[PDB]
Design a protein around this ligand. Structure first.
Ligand SMILES: [Mg+2]
Ligand SMILES: [Mg+2]
Ligand SMILES: [Mg+2]
Ligand SMILES: [Mg+2]
Ligand SMILES: [Mg+2]
Ligand SMILES: [Mg+2]
Ligand SMILES: [Mg+2]
Ligand SMILES: [Mg+2]
Ligand SMILES: [Mg+2]
Ligand SMILES: [Mg+2]
Ligand SMILES: [Mg+2]
Ligand SMILES: [Mg+2]
Ligand SMILES: [Mg+2]
Ligand SMILES: [Mg+2]
Ligand SMILES: [Mg+2]
Ligand SMILES: [Mg+2]
Ligand SMILES: [Mg+2]
Ligand SMILES: [Zn+2]
Lengths: 60, 84, 177, 115
RNA sequence: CCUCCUAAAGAGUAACGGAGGAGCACGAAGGUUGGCUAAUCCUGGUCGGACAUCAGGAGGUUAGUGCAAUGGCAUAAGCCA
RNA sequence: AGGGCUACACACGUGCUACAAUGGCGCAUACAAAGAGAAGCGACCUCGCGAGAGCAAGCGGACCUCAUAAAGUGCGUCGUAGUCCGGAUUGGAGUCUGCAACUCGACUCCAUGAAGUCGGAAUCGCUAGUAAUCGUGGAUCAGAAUGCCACGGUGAAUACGU
């Protein structure tokens, strides 16, 4: 990389709600608080009609 | 909508026709004027010709139609646009 | 470098077993990642081209290269040489670190994320995807956003086919629906 | 701040701020906060990270945001695909609930279109 | 005044013969050193569409040349510093 | 019997509801008049978030019921934003009347949250308990008012003059 031209780019900590904590280089400066991550998002884990209804509402 | 405690309304003559038609193989359409009847699960696969005021519109009953009223599938007004 | 060690230690073994490669040099590599913004709406405002180039800098950790029009195009009101985009080429350590920030942090933040298309390979093994809002990257401050910019991300790979490219990406638990 | 994939206004009372989520009105806002033990006049900024996590946990009990949007789109598509009266009304951008169309109906029809 | 053809494979060669251009531009668009390679289409990709920017492929100058045409031009005379 | 009178590029009349802070929301709490009721009005209690439901008194009524008036006032909050303004539209789930709510009912709940930031030319009502504003009741009626008819509450401005 060239000198003097690029964003400041240093290690920080990304702390997610699910107890996942990852140290990562970034430009954000401060530390991150993640409401979701790759280890708790439902797509990544896998946490992702008329006859039924008619017969359940009209039990004879 | 009809109160749940009353259950689903269907005309008695249509209920009889549908029972007769399910009991003996799929016949020609069921000619009916009972637009107000609820589509029951035991009509799925039957063709029902629902009066719209002038004609009997064919309605092939599928599962997605269950719980709807037959007249929902036979429009009563003709409209193709103004300034046409 | 977390994902580069994961590649050297687990991905190579999985792919060697699967494709029955004779040499490890045959296993596909992630060669580069290119991030591109098309800012064609900067022919009116040049100041819109810079701010987009600010986002890219924040997202990649790397000053972007302003791209310009290869030829004049009268439909889009662009003359040859007019700056209407910006891009970064990430390689090596920076590439692996952005790849980790994208897989583990940014993609979980996509609104209504239901998976990435496994269709978006170029026929030769390389994977392009679009990002509709730059906010999914926590570097981009929400209280600081000027305009809702997007971008596109290309992952250029040494794989010979799309089968090999998607095997490589899925070895990193890339979220293919 | 970030709940259900969206940013909630930080300077408003929690009740008003939660209604920024697609699928949360005033009643569901009160229900969420009373199930999380949080006063309604608490501004979102005056909230611990842990309390925001409790709020997030109580919002996940309701279908909101993109799940709600695709539910609604599925219900309307089902109507349009069936060809029932309501489906045809949705197709032609006309009132679906029996309103007069001789006059008014501008919300469905949009701005006046002169002959 | 310039380019092509008429012009008969050296030069030159007429007609109120057949077609086009010039009456400038550039302190870099000149010098040199170092580098670089086109058009076009296909596939993938936020907005983005026939056509912008990005990635890969095919192609191989079908590009380019400050302005006509011809002859040149990759060791580029083309493009960047 | 079923459909239509409820159509819908559009134009006009009469209204309702707004565009907010002289206001919205929450809690608390004052002060009316008029009227209706037996296949009717329906208390209390119990259940339901609610519309309602179950059970069941009283009343052909200055007795019982419909049936807390609301604006107001006190406290708190919102802080001028398309908003804690507006409440159209649509999805889902229900209730009731009624043989029957698809065309085409009213109402409830959850969600949604449009136009609209005071309206061009022009034009209407009103001289006092009036205008304005706030609620209440009745006829018609199984059900179906923002209309009609009626009732009180608060309560102005201005009229030199022809
Ligand atoms: Mg609501
Ligand atoms: Mg109506
Ligand atoms: Mg010669
Ligand atoms: Mg010769
Ligand atoms: Mg001679
Ligand atoms: Mg050279
Ligand atoms: Mg040169
Ligand atoms: Mg009749
Ligand atoms: Mg009429
Ligand atoms: Mg409101
Ligand atoms: Mg009386
Ligand atoms: Mg507007
Ligand atoms: Mg305002
Ligand atoms: Mg008078
Ligand atoms: Mg009134
Ligand atoms: Mg009455
Ligand atoms: Mg009535
Ligand atoms: Zn997590």
């Amino acid at each position: 990389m060239k000198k003097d031209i690029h964003p400041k780019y240093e290690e920080i900590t990304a702390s997610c709600s699910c107890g996942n904590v990852m140290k990562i280089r970034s430009t954000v400066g401060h530390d991150l608080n993640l409401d979701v991550c790759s280890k708790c998002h439902p797509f990544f884990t896998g946490k992702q009609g008329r006859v039924d209804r008619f017969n359940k509402r009209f039990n004879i | 909508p009809r109160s749940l405690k009353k259950g689903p309304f269907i005309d008695l003559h249509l209920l009889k026709k549908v029972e007769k038609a399910v009991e003996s193989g799929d016949k020609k359409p069921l000619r009916t004027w009972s637009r107000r009847s609820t589509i029951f699960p035991n009509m799925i696969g039957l063709t029902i010709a629902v009066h719209n005021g002038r004609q009997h519109v064919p309605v092939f009953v599928t599962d997605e139609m269950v719980g709807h009223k037959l007249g929902e599938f036979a429009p009563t007004r003709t409209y193709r646009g103004h300034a046409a | 470098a977390k994902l580069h060690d994961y590649y050297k230690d687990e991905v190579v073994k999985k792919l060697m077993t699967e494709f029955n490669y004779n040499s490890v040099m045959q296993v596909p590599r992630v060669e580069k990642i290119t991030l591109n913004m098309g800012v064609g709406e900067a022919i009116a405002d040049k100041k819109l081209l810079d701010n987009a180039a600010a986002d890219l800098a924040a997202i990649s950790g790397q000053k972007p290269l302003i791209t310009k029009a290869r030829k004049s195009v009268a439909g889009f009101k662009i003359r040859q040489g007019y700056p209407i985009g910006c891009k970064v080429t990430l390689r090596g350590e920076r590439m692996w670190e952005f790849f980790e920030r994208l897989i583990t942090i940014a993609v979980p933040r996509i609104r209504d994320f239901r998976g990435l298309s496994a269709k978006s390979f170029d026929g030769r093994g390389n994977y392009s995807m679009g990002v509709r809002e730059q906010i999914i990257f926590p570097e981009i401050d929400y209280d600081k956003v000027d305009r809702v910019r997007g971008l596109d991300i290309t992952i250029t790979t040494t794989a010979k086919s799309d089968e090999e490219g998607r095997a490589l990406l899925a070895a990193f638990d890339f979220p293919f629906r | 701040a970030r709940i259900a994939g969206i940013n909630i206004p930080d300077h408003k009372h929690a009740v008003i701020a939660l209604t920024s989520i697609y699928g949360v009105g005033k009643t569901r806002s009160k229900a969420i906060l009373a199930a999380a033990g949080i006063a309604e006049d608490v501004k979102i900024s005056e909230l611990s990270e842990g309390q925001i996590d409790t709020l997030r946990d109580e919002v996940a009990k309701f279908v909101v945001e993109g799940d709600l949007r695709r539910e609604i789109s599925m219900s309307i598509k089902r109507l349009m695909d069936l060809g029932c009266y309501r489906g045809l009304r949705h197709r032609r951008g006309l009132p679906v609930r029996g309103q007069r169309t001789k006059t008014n109906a501008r919300t469905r029809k949009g701005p006046r279109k002169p002959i």
